[PDB]
Amino acid sequence: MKIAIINMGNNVINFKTVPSSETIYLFKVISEMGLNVDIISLKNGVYTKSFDEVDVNDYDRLIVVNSNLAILSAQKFMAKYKSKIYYLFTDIRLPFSQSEEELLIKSPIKVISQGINLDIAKAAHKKVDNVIEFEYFPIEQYKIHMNDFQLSKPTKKTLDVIYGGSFRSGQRESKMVEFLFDTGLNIEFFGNAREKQFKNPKYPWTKAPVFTGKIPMNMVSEKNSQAIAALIIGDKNYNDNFITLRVWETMASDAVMLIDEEFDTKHRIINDARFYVNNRAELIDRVNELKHSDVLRKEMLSIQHDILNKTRAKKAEWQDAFKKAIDL
């Protein structure tokens, strides 16, 4: 059984970019499952093999992630594969889609949805003509199942709330402004967003949080740990659907995880109302409570790390479910 992983939109080579990084981490966790795996990209290197140095049909399973030569190359390569393509649907904005006959992909496609609501995964892929089947699998838990995963230790607090990410093309501007702007709290927004991007008239604000630059994927939980709390919000279609990597990066940190009620109305992540907030007012009160009650803050951290540990204790079941999802 030989498996190959391709990144459809970006060149994979190092841990410089987030797309290249998450691809090497998937590869790492899949390898640690005891599977013979290769990443195919533009160049041969210490992590990758080039498209021209391999025969697409030597692989029994072809896994595709998404995050231009890399695109053209991947399409051309996939177009020659004679079996089913397993697409990891990790971002609602990145469903599978085709880029004339040398690029036309005719193979059936299995979309492994990170979101539990398969109707949303279907609607996003409605323009796909290929035979396509859907299945849910919590792909994002790959970070916590990695062999060298370590929980973040107690850190000195220099911030109240923190959030790391990008602007997502304004996909969640409403929520960012509601919870991170004009709170009168000491907030930091790290990543690719910039204050200037928040120009939508529908969401007025007076004072913005502090925008700092992006950090490596492997530094996120350590960065989150500088604050009392770290916020979990999502796009509209993530609500009650996707559990994102930020949930685990936050849960593993020394920052108490505060979740937008709308993101998880059933309280699937943690069945404890103290971790959820409905609006800006509740976020403020909740952070003030945490700042002034160490017993509370420490109790909540202990509860979230516990949940994290119980999930990590089901690694074998997670690995099996992954193998089954790729027809093994």
Ligand X SMILES: O=c1ccn([C@@H]2O[C@H](COP(=O)(O)OP(=O)(O)O)[C@@H](O)[C@H]2O)c(=O)[nH]1
Distance in Å, CB of 274 to ligand X, minimum? 22
* Cα of 84 vs its chain's centroid, Å: 24
Q: For residues 328 and 321, what is the distance between their CA atoms, to the nearest angstrom? A: 10
Of the two residues 18 and 128, which places its CB atom closer to ligand X in the complex? Answer: 18
209 close to 231: Cβ distance less than 8 angstroms: no
Of the two residues 11 and 244, which places its CB atom closer to ligand X in the complex? Answer: 244
Of the two residues 245 and 270, which places its CB atom closer to ligand X in the complex? Answer: 245
Distance in Å, CB of 245 to ligand X, minimum? 5
Distance in Å, CB of 224 to ligand X, minimum? 9
Instruction: Tell me the residue type at 161.
Output: V
Distance in Å, CB of 20 to ligand X, minimum? 11
CB atoms within 10 A of CB 94: 16
Interface residue with ligand X among 160, 249, 254, 264 (CB under 6 A) is 249
**Which 8-state DSSP code applies to residue 42?**
S
Length of the chain: 328
Convert residues 165-194 into a mask of x (bound to ligand X by CB under 6 A) and - (unbound). xx-x---------------------xx---
In three state form, how does the secondary structure of 139-180 look? HHHHHHHCCCCCCCCCCCCCEEEEEEECCHHHCCHHHHHHHH
Interface residue with ligand X among 125, 246, 297, 315 (CB under 6 A) is 246
Q: Which stretch binds ligand X (CB under 6 A): 61-69, 101-109, 181-189, 239-247?
A: 239-247
290 close to 230: Cβ distance less than 8 angstroms: no
Of the two residues 251 and 300, which places its CB atom closer to ligand X in the complex? Answer: 251
Structure tokens at 165: 């990410």
DSSP letters spanning 81-95: --S-EEEEE--TT--
235 close to 262: Cβ distance less than 8 angstroms: no
Q: Which residues within the stretch 141-170 sit at the binding site for ligand X (CB under 6 A)? A: 164-166, 168
Binding flag, residue 19, ligand X (CB under 6 A): no
Sheet holding 2-7, edge to edge: 48-50, 36-41, 2-7, 61-65, 85-89, 109-113, 132-136
Q: For residues 110 and 164, what is the distance between their CA atoms, to the nearest angstrom? A: 31
Convert residues 208-237 into a mask of x (bound to ligand X by CB under 6 A) and - (unbound). ------xx-x--x-------------x---
Ranked by CB distance to ligand X, the top (closest) residue is 165
Of the two residues 85 and 283, which places its CB atom closer to ligand X in the complex? Answer: 283
Binding flag, residue 124, ligand X (CB under 6 A): no
Interface residue with ligand X among 11, 113, 241, 244 (CB under 6 A) is 244
**Footprint of ligand X on this chain (CB under 6 A)?**
18, 164-166, 168, 190-191, 214-215, 217, 220, 234, 244-246, 249
